[PDB]
């Protein structure tokens, strides 16, 4: 049916938008603290702390398999990255402060993202 391909054309362009959004978000992490998952060999207790780990690589894997049906879901994962970071790492840490920086800067990008998603459809 054509009624699936327009949803897929919506999903597609959503993806095409969200790829730009991700690139912009990852650019706000020049330190690359959030690019790859946490190691469970380096941090073997991690999953005792963080129940839903997230990172840009994983976000990107999902993205390119069109795993995001809307912006909300994408925001949810972006939020995890920040949120997980801010929980695991204490407040005086570089890690923690990198999260906050990324949040504040990311939110700008997501503010306009939300606008474009509604504006296009």
Swiss-Prot record:
There is a cross-link at residue 41 (Glycyl lysine isopeptide (Lys-Gly) (interchain with G-Cter in SUMO2)). This is Bromodomain-containing protein 1. Scaffold subunit of various histone acetyltransferase (HAT) complexes, such as the MOZ/MORF and HBO1 complexes, that acts as a regulator of hematopoiesis. Plays a key role in HBO1 complex by directing KAT7/HBO1 specificity towards histone H3 'Lys-14' acetylation (H3K14ac), thereby promoting erythroid differentiation. Residues 9-113 form the Bromo domain. It is found in: Nucleus; Chromosome. Highly expressed in testis. The gene is BRD1. Component of some HBO1 complex composed of KAT7/HBO1, MEAF6, ING4 and BRD1/BRPF2. Component of the MOZ/MORF complex composed at least of ING5, KAT6A, KAT6B, MEAF6 and one of BRPF1, BRD1/BRPF2 and BRPF3. Interacts (via PHD-type zinc finger domain) with unmodified histone H3. Interacts (via PWWP domain) with dimethylated and trimethylated 'Lys-79' on histone H3. It comes from the Eukaryota.
